[PDB]
Scaffold this active site. Structure first.
Site, PDB file in Angstrom:
ATOM      1  N   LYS A   1      14.102 -27.190  38.937  1.00 47.31           N
ATOM      2  CA  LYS A   1      14.235 -26.742  40.318  1.00 47.31           C
ATOM      3  C   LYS A   1      15.316 -27.480  41.093  1.00 47.31           C
ATOM      4  CE  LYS A   1      10.091 -28.302  40.334  1.00 47.31           C
ATOM      5  NZ  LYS A   1      10.294 -29.420  39.372  1.00 47.31           N
ATOM      6  N   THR A   2      15.551 -28.759  40.790  1.00 48.29           N
ATOM      7  CA  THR A   2      16.583 -29.510  41.499  1.00 48.29           C
ATOM      8  C   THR A   2      17.965 -28.907  41.273  1.00 48.29           C
ATOM      9  OG1 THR A   2      15.273 -31.539  41.319  1.00 48.29           O
ATOM     10  CG2 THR A   2      17.625 -31.774  41.794  1.00 48.29           C
TER      11      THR A   2
ATOM     12  N   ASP B   1      14.940 -34.359  47.853  1.00 49.32           N
ATOM     13  CA  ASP B   1      14.596 -34.222  46.445  1.00 49.32           C
ATOM     14  C   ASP B   1      13.314 -34.986  46.147  1.00 49.32           C
ATOM     15  OD1 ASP B   1      15.075 -33.023  44.036  1.00 49.32           O
ATOM     16  OD2 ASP B   1      16.803 -34.259  43.489  1.00 49.32           O
ATOM     17  N   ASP B   2      12.390 -34.328  45.449  1.00 53.72           N
ATOM     18  CA  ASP B   2      11.160 -34.951  44.963  1.00 53.72           C
ATOM     19  C   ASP B   2      10.354 -35.540  46.124  1.00 53.72           C
ATOM     20  OD1 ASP B   2      10.272 -34.615  42.381  1.00 53.72           O
ATOM     21  OD2 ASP B   2      11.165 -36.450  41.586  1.00 53.72           O
TER      22      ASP B   2
ATOM     23  N   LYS C   1      11.253 -30.712  62.962  1.00 49.59           N
ATOM     24  CA  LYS C   1      11.190 -29.827  64.115  1.00 49.59           C
ATOM     25  C   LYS C   1      12.191 -30.191  65.203  1.00 49.59           C
ATOM     26  CE  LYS C   1       7.010 -29.830  65.531  1.00 49.59           C
ATOM     27  NZ  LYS C   1       5.557 -30.101  65.705  1.00 49.59           N
TER      28      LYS C   1
ATOM     29  N   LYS D   1      14.076 -27.467  30.311  1.00 47.89           N
ATOM     30  CA  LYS D   1      14.371 -28.859  29.981  1.00 47.89           C
ATOM     31  C   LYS D   1      13.594 -29.303  28.745  1.00 47.89           C
ATOM     32  CE  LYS D   1      14.693 -33.395  32.220  1.00 47.89           C
ATOM     33  NZ  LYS D   1      13.986 -34.363  33.102  1.00 47.89           N
TER      34      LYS D   1
END
Ligand SMILES: Nc1ncnc2c1ncn2[C@@H]1O[C@H](COP(=O)(O)OP(=O)(O)OP(=O)(O)O)[C@@H](O)[C@H]1O
Ligand SMILES: Nc1ncnc2c1ncn2[C@@H]1O[C@H](COP(=O)(O)OP(=O)(O)OP(=O)(O)O)[C@@H](O)[C@H]1O
Ligand SMILES: Nc1ncnc2c1ncn2[C@@H]1O[C@H](COP(=O)(O)OP(=O)(O)OP(=O)(O)O)[C@@H](O)[C@H]1O
Lengths: 535, 83, 83
Positions: free
Chosen positions: A344-345, A398-399, A426, A503
């Site tokens: 996904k990254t 990320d993560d 926000k 992967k």
């Protein structure tokens, strides 16, 4: 005698991309010293005696200060370079400060309304103008100097033949009392240039060199300006200097000794190739992008093994277009979620790159090993603050799960980081700009339970490989097993279903490839079978 | 070599197939990490019942790696250290 | 006045002269001798940091607090400056 020099001209100044700021500074500082004194007296006003400037490094502050100092047909401006007035003997610092204003006071008391004009430069004003403690036990290291300066600038006596200027990088630390309209009234900000500004800067730093035929016809100035995006002022000059140096270095040589040619040095020329070379590996922009991070995140590239990758990219493009050409929603966020090892990254990085925005920054935990929660909060605050200085931006988190410091036992995590991220998702940017945030994760239920899905505006799904046909297509695209083994493997996988991430498929292929030439397929099949599904 | 001499106190004795199996599976991983290009990082985890002799085999595999840099991080050099 | 006059026994970093100055000023303003033609005016932004011994009656009695004006005050302020 006119205040301005008789021969001064704007074009000789050598400044580009700050026309409005200079015009406003002139209007607010010098407009009152141009017409005869009779009308000024009639209006019964007093001339301003203060200026201030601030901005990020490399924007043209000192240049403007020196130019404005030289623009006046008066005495030579004084100078003070940071803490150059401090002393060890009691009370000498204040005497040193007072000595500066003595000449102006004498002039005023002597000659009255026709007195001369004086200038000063408190460069690095922030060094010795920190806010007063205003509390017992917090005695400041420099307080008497600040009090003396405040008294002298505007005290029991009045002056109308002085002008102060300041420059700093932290406009939020200057003493509060030193910023009221009576002492320092006109303050301006210096920001990064725009396209026209970059063009002007490049033109000014090249006019002279064109005088003696030092430019071939291959240099397209407009293309060079358009190519370089969001470059500070100094970096253009740095690029030009590096290009000139590399072009000149070809004629000269050395190695064992040092020598110079005399029959070729008279045909010197600089072409676009040296410019390109240097642009690539010479000057590394600070508020831009570079291919190193993408090369680190896209190490194995992207392969179109099915339909979902196209739909995901199309959705990303749609979101980018929405944020870029919309005004009612200047803040849109999207959250990427999927099972572990689904890759996904890489999709996030590809979307960010293809967005074609001037500014892109990737905040990842890789750079924050062992930090404390305060350091992490500070880093995130700094990054988001930096992202507020561009007409278009894009940030990738990320993560997230590893950022919150989550651990199923207990469970346990850091509350401060979660609160900071919630408040920071926000905060609308300063009026007239845009922003875009992309996140990633591998556990949607946890976030859904912590009441976090009400902060993100949408959500996308990234699936795994679902059928043997897609696995076969990916295998063929990678190009490791040939047709002969492809038939045998297909005869097996075709009659069932699979559940694996790309992967893991790569790692399995690599592990299998280490065996003998005619034992690879069997071990590959065994590993695939042992992997399992675990829906 | 002092670290290896310390963590291997009585050498290695082959008392059955499992030792050979482990030592043969180690070299496969070593060759994979040395000859591969699509996977520059590889990790392996050893596990077994208490008092089975894991550290010795790990050290022997690392020494047989023949790599030009081998550092062993152990928890017995940080007695009293904080997190 | 805040710069020179502070509470005694605080700034003790090589204070070659500060407490002696404040003590001398205290003595001179109202000591054994008396005067009838002295008037002391002081302006400060930190009322609560001055020495209490200097706030006693007979030394500094009148204390006034200057605040932001109101609509009427704003009117007068803007009328005076534009006459
Ligand atoms: N608009 C501009 N045109 C040409 N040169 C510029 C411009 N703005 C800045 N410069 C360059 O700035 C250089 C001087 O550095 P500069 O004074 O801009 O740094 P600075 O912003 O003062 O840095 P600091 O944050 O340390 O104060 C000169 O080489 C000058 O050519
Ligand atoms: N078509 C593709 N789609 C996705 N990833 C791909 C594709 N082709 C190759 N890859 C590789 O997939 C790898 C997946 O990235 P990464 O190592 O960050 O794993 P991840 O599963 O996204 O992360 P995590 O372990 O945090 O769940 C990328 O490094 C990329 O090299
Ligand atoms: N073939 C063998 N395999 C493993 N250990 C062996 C072998 N032959 C002898 N040994 C002895 O096994 C001992 C194992 O020592 P070590 O403290 O590393 O044990 P461990 O079981 O891995 O550790 P722990 O006590 O932490 O569970 C070594 O001192 C070595 O003397």
């Amino acid at each position: 005698q006119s205040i301005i020099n008789p021969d001064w001209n704007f074009e000789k100044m050598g400044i580009g991309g700050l026309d409005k700021e200079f015009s406003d500074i002139f209007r607010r500082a010098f407009a009152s010293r141009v017409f005869p004194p009779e009308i000024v007296e009639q209006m019964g006003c007093k001339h301003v005696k203060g200026i201030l400037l601030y901005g990020p490094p490399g924007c043209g502050k000192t240049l403007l200060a020196r130019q404005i100092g030289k623009m006046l047909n008066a005495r030579e401006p004084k100078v003070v370079n940071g803490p150059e007035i401090l002393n060890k003997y009691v009370g000498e610092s204040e005497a040193n400060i007072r000595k500066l204003f003595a000449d102006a006071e004498e002039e005023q008391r002597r000659l009255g309304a026709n007195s001369g004009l004086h200038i000063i430069i408190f460069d690095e004003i922030d060094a010795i103008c920190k806010q007063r403690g205003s509390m017992a036990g917090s005695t400041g290291v420099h307080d008497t100097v600040v009090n003396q300066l405040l008294s002298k600038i505007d005290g029991v006596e009045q002056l109308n033949n002085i002008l102060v200027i300041g420059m700093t990088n932290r406009p939020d630390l200057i003493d509060e009392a030193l910023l009221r309209p009576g002492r320092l009234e006109v303050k301006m900000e210096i920001g990064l240039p725009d396209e026209k500004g970059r063009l002007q800067i490049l033109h000014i730093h090249t006019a002279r060199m064109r005088g003696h035929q030092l430019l071939s016809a291959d240099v397209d100035i407009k293309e060079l300006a358009v190519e370089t995006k969001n470059f500070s002022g100094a970096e253009l000059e740095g690029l030009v200097r590096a290009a000139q140096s590399t072009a000149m270095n070809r004629h000269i040589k050395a190695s064992t000794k040092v020598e110079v040619d005399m029959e070729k040095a008279e045909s010197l020329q600089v072409t676009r190739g040296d410019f390109l070379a240097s642009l690539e590996n010479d000057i590394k922009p600070a508020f831009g992008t570079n291919q190193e991070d993408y090369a680190s995140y896209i190490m194995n590239g992207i392969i179109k093994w099915g339909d979902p990758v196209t739909r995901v990219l199309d959705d990303g493009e749609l979101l980018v277009q929405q944020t870029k050409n919309s005004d009612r929603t200047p803040l849109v966020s999207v959250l990427l979620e999927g099972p572990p090892h689904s890759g996904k990254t890489a999709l996030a990085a590809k979307i960010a790159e293809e967005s074609n925005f001037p500014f892109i920054k990737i905040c990842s935990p890789d750079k924050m090993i062992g930090f404390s929660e305060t350091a992490k909060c500070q880093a995130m605050k700094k990054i988001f603050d930096d992202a507020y200085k561009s007409q278009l931006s894009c940030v990738v988190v990320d993560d997230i799960e590893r950022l919150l410091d989550y651990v199923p036992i207990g469970p346990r995590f850091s509350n401060l980081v979660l609160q900071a991220l919630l408040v920071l998702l926000k905060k609308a940017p300063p009026q007239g700009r845009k922003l875009l945030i992309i996140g990633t994760t591998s556990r949607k239920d946890v976030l859904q339970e912590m009441e976090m899905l009400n902060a993100f505006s949408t959500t996308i799904h990234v699936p795994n490989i679902a059928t043997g046909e897609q696995l076969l297509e990916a295998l063929e695209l990678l190009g490791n097993f040939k047709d002969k083994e492809r038939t045998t493997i297909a005869q097996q996988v075709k009659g069932k279903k699979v559940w694996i991430g790309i992967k893991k498929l790569l790692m399995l292929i690599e592990m299998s490839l280490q065996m003998d030439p005619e034992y690879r397929v069997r071990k590959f099949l065994a590993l695939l079978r042992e992997e399992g599904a675990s829906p």
